[PDB]
């Protein structure tokens, strides 16, 4: 059985935080669906890179369930994710079935908006800490990648490779992650 990943892509998303996990996961043999929050139309990311999604979120929602749901960062992208009822439904369903939820940079603040994983240890971009910690519902970590139960978080664009390889390790195991890592020419 092939593992499946849902990447939710909204206007203002950080394009590096979107493309790196998608690329690395597909290198790992994972079937990745880049789903546009607003539909199938091309999405303008935070630094004006325009990415064409594979499907609308409405259509991808019907082809579940997914072994991981991935929330990229970018301040405005994360705000759009935080305001979407469709994202709320997807995340709550994923939480209930004990599937993996992965969010990077500003992305984790959507978990707060939708009341997902309260009590977990999480990290964010340093500039998103105060927002994430409103109410004290999580415990904050400064680790570059943090995994507490089914909640996997990471800090920023420069942690995107470590974030993506952590997803691969969680889904396909340490050996696949190591095999995928070698041709990337990462430092550590």
């Amino acid at each position: 059985a092939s593992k499946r990943a849902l990447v939710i892509l909204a206007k203002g998303a950080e394009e590096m935080e979107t493309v790196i996990p998608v690329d690395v996961m597909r290198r790992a043999g994972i079937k990745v669906t880049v789903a546009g929050l607003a539909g199938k139309d091309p999405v303008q990311c935070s630094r004006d890179v325009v990415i064409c999604p594979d499907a609308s979120l409405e259509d991808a929602k019907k082809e579940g369930p997914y072994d991981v749901v991935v929330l990229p960062g970018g301040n405005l992208g994360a705000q759009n994710l935080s305001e979407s009822a469709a994202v709320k439904e997807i995340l709550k369903e994923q939480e209930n079935r004990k599937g993996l939820i992965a969010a990077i940079c500003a992305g984790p603040t959507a978990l707060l908006a939708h009341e997902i994983g309260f009590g977990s240890k999480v990290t964010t971009h340093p500039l998103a800490k105060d927002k994430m910690m409103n109410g004290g519902h999580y415990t904050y970590s400064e680790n570059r990648v943090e995994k507490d139960g089914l909640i996997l978080t990471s800090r920023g664009p420069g942690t995107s490779f470590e974030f993506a390889l952590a997803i691969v390790e969680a889904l396909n195991g340490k050996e696949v992650a190591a095999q995928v890592k070698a041709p990337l020419v990462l430092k550590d």
Copy 2:
């Protein structure tokens, strides 16, 4: 005066090696044009990420000159770049006016195809070394980023941040590169 960068995007390009420099350069205030080799149509990258270029290469060619020309990697992307007469013209013109040329991963093999910068020290992805060194026209380096004169090269997807920041440093100086680097949460 605002610096200008041309990123040439061909089918089969490595999408991480394309988006990271584009994003980082725009964070540095550089005006970046992502030009499609085959036209304005969306480009399917090596791991099936589809990126919409800002312009066709034919149109971007007329809005020169550029302070840097950037050649992403990806084996099939680099082959398409190596076979394009339009790329040859752009690179030869850039060489003659002593503008910066930057290529990453498999991208530098296009310099060999078009007889650009012979005698320079260069690096490539390890799997592209033999191709680059056919004839002994360059001197090979295993540094993660290599800069010899106006030729800047880098090794792979995992060196894309260092590659992009080297471009920023060359164009805008060390202080801007350091300012752009801090919010990325890079390790070193």
